[PDB]
């Protein structure tokens, strides 16, 4: 919605300053560890041929985006639940309760949760997330797509994550803090304010992906 348009114009602004062509680029002066995101996808598995795409946030909370456009999130407490239908309504259940309507989707939310815990590696394991509100519900995965060069994930709180398969690098763009986190080939990370990148620019690695990440935002809003 407005968040996707907000993100898009922030990317056009940094890409129009031509940040890599600077007499002296100082991306060392755009850091903001006070802008590290609260949640981000650190595990995911795509089984869309049968059920959908299951994931895990930085908290152990597990969510699944099913093929029928419904969603099921299991909080990192192991019990609390959240079900969101295609049309948007939310419902708050538990696993201690026995909602018969979903017992075939809870089993598959469990299968995804077991697989990710069994085989896949937690991305951003060396990052301290930033503290969130006390009684804040988790965000769900609104829309995702997966190409050959990268995968794109769009949470319900605006954050857009992009993992490049070849470089292993990862971007986490937040339109609210106006920041991006770049994860290095060596799993090193940093958070840069976006308006500061206009004034000081950045290296070729970060600059290149900010240009590519714009066309991906354009493909989320073309749909």
């Amino acid at each position: 919605e407005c968040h996707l348009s907000d993100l898009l114009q922030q990317l056009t602004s940094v890409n129009a300053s031509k940040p890599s062509e600077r007499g002296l680029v100082r991306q060392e002066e755009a850091e903001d560890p006070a802008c590290i995101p609260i949640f981000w996808v650190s595990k995911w598995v795509d089984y869309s041929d049968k059920y959908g795409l299951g994931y895990q946030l930085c908290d152990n909370s597990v969510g699944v985006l099913f093929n029928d456009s419904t969603r099921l999130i299991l909080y990192n407490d192991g019990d609390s639940l959240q079900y969101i239908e295609r049309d948007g309504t939310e419902s708050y259940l538990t696993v201690s309760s026995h909602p018969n309507s979903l017992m075939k989707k809870i089993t598959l939310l469990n299968y995804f949760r077991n697989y990710m815990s069994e085989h896949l590696l937690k991305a951003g394991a060396n990052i301290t997330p930033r503290e969130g509100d006390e009684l804040a519900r988790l965000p769900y995965l609104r829309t995702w797509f997966r190409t050959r060069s990268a995968i794109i994930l769009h949470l319900s709180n605006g954050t857009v994550q992009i993992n490049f398969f070849q470089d292993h690098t990862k971007l986490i763009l937040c339109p609210l803090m106006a920041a991006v986190t770049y994860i290095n080939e060596k799993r090193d990370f940093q958070t840069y304010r976006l308006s500061l990148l206009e004034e000081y620019g950045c290296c070729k690695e970060l600059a290149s992906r900010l240009r590519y990440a714009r066309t991906m935002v354009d493909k989320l809003l073309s749909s």
Partner: peptide, 8 residues
């Protein structure tokens, strides 16, 4: 099916 980065 396509999983993300395997523990390794």
């Amino acid at each position: 099916h396509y999983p993300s980065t395997t523990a390794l």
